[PDB]
Amino acid sequence: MLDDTKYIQMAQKFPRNVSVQLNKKLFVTRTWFRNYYFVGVFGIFAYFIYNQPKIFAPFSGYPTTVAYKAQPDFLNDQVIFYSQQRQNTLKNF
Amino acid sequence: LRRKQQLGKIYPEEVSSYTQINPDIANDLNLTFNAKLLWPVRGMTVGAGFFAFAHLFNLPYSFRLGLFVLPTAVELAFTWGNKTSQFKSIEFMDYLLQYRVSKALLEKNAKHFAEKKAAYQKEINSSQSVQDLYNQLITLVSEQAPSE
Numbered sequence: 001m002l003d004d005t006k007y008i009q010m011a012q013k014f015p016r017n018v019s020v021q022l023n024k025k026l027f028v029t030r031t032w033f034r035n036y037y038f039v040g041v042f043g044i045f046a047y048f049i050y051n052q053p054k055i056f057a058p059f060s061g062y063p064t065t066v067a068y069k070a071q072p073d074f075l076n077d078q079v080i081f082y083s084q085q086r087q088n089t090l091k092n093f
Numbered sequence: 094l095r096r097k098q099q100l101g102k103i104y105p106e107e108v109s110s111y112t113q114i115n116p117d118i119a120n121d122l123n124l125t126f127n128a129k130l131l132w133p134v135r136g137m138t139v140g141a142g143f144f145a146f147a148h149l150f151n152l153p154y155s156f157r158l159g160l161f162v163l164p165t166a167v168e169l170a171f172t173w174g175n176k177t178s179q180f181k182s183i184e185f186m187d188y189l190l191q192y193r194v195s196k197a198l199l200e201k202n203a204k205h206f207a208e209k210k211a212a213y214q215k216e217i218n219s220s221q222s223v224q225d226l227y228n229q230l231i232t233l234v235s236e237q238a239p240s241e
């Protein structure tokens with residue numbers, strides 16, 4: 001057994017009205033250092049994990065696409081379009 | 094690549110035409126094809142704002158350079174990739190190919206339809222498509238015309 005007598009005494013008896021004012025500027029500085037080392041360092045890894053699957057497997061993020069057929073309109077020099085909904089699938093392996 | 098090879102080249106007029114259905118058509122085609130070099134203007138603007146903040150609050154030049162690089166990196170990351178842009182470019186290229194085929198047929202048959210076009214202009218005051226007008230006429234006949 002470890003002789004933890006002093007630590008046990010400290011745990012049993014501690015002040016219950018002592019507090020220390022904290023420098024808001026220094027607290028904010030440390031918190032924003034943590035935010036800097038979070039965003040500018042860990043966001044690279046997080047965005048890699050989030051996006052690299054989306055780059056190497058794009059067909060699964062766009063389920064439906066559209067296709068068009070056109071016919072001429074001579075007497076009015078217009079172009080008529082007919083649309084169609086298709087399931088986005090691989091083509092020409 | 095196959096669709097772009099079939100189309101050959103893309104002009105801004107067709108992109109403006111497809112703006113009807115895809116307002117971000119240009120913003121997607123620029124990310125899909127190597128048309129022009131894309132600078133992260135928004136990221137650089139945010140970096141300049143952070144630089145002004147750092148200058149005002151007397152932050153180190155290393156810190157402000159890092160805060161300029163970071164938004165630029167975010168903008169580049171959110172810009173490059175985006176295969177949804179490639180999908181929309183494929184859709185636009187299909188639309189453009191169909192439009193060009195129809196335009197080629199129009200040009201081919203312009204002389205043949207010239208004579209008929211004058212009487213059609215002199216008889217019909219509407220600019221709507223012949224196909225749509227004929228479909229409406231067919232519906233009108235199916236509804237009102239007596240079967241007898």
Ligand SMILES: CCCCCCCCCCCCCCCCCC(=O)OC[C@H](COP(=O)(O)OCCN)OC(=O)CCCCCCCCCCCCCCCCC
Pocket residue numbers: 028029032033035036039150151152153156
């Ligand atoms: C559509 C609407 C969108 C709206 C978005 C709004 C965004 C608002 C963002 C507000 C950011 C406030 C940042 C405040 C930083 C305060 C830092 C501070 O108080 O500490 C100063 C300290 C000084 O440095 P020191 O070396 O101690 O030198 C002594 C100089 N007197 O300096 C330091 O110790 C270094 C401080 C580093 C600060 C890092 C900041 C990182 C910010 C990341 C933001 C990411 C946002 C992503 C948004 C994505 C949207 C798609």
